[PDB]
């Protein structure tokens, strides 16, 4: 991964919706839970070993391919991308007969 952008943001101020664990009290109930604006958690990830910039480049180089996928499907909203990537990950190793001492077989 060679970052070929004009400039790069070395700092990643990321937000996500995955809970960090240790949910306090009964705040998981939607009635007592936060509004749509306060369900996010934040974090700061610095540029380590040239990762951050590279990540951005990756996104760029992904875009084209992703667009083509969105052209092929007729889903108004596509959520099953990560699941499909996992399925292909499993098929890559265990899709066919797994011959011991083979290149396409991951055993011991």
């Amino acid at each position, epitope marked *: 991964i060679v970052n070929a952008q004009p*400039k790069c943001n070395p700092n990643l*101020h990321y937000w996500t919706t995955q809970d960090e664990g240790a949910a306090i009290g009964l705040a998981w109930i939607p009635y007592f839970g936060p509004a749509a604006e306060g369900i996010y958690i934040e974090g700061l990830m610095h*540029n380590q070993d040239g990762l951050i910039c590279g990540l951005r480049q990756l996104a760029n180089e992904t875009t084209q391919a992703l667009q083509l996928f969105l052209r092929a499907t007729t889903e108004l909203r596509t959520f099953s991308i990560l699941n499909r990537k996992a399925i292909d990950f499993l098929l890559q190793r265990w899709g066919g007969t797994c011959h011991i001492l083979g290149p396409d077989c991951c055993i011991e």
Partner: antibody
Amino acid sequence: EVQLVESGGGLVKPGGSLRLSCAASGFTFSNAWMSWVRQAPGKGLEWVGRIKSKTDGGTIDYAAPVKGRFTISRDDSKNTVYLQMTSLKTEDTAVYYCTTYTEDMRYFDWLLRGGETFDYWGQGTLVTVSS
Amino acid sequence: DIRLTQSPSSLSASVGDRVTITCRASHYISTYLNWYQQKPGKAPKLLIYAASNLQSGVPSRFSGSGFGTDFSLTISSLQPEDFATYHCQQSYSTPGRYTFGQGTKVEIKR
């Protein structure tokens, strides 16, 4: 690998002129921004001036207590930057440091703000003004 | 235009302690701070650019943090060569008169 050397400092009487020279080696001088930052004995660091590269137009900016009395210039064929001091006042007695804003840190600024991060610092020179 | 205020002004700690210096800004600034190390008699040496980013060659014990108005510099375990005065400088706008902080001088305890 990168080294900067300041020269020209000395004693000058209040109201006189003085010329400071900054020699640089180890990088691409024509693409880097240069800056002068002075340190008073009891006032900490104080930014003096900034000059862009010939690519961005080479516009010059000065500090508020400094405008109208100093003038910055640069020579790319010799990789040198000069600071001229006219109508100098006793409050300008300081240790002057010459700094560079390399092209690599231009690449890390992503919001395209004019401010710069000072990459490398030279030995510095002493400028004393007293009667 | 922009004011930077460091805290504390002086600090005394032992070898191997966790040291934290705070830099506060007057206006809004999104990770334009820079941490410089200046040893007495020598020139300031750039340690941290933007936020939490270490310059090549800086040891791993140095770390930055924070955004917006407040920023934090942290040394995990002090060492004898870390004795120096550290400064925080903003790069959000064209530098004003108070763009460089007054400075925080770290002192080693024995």
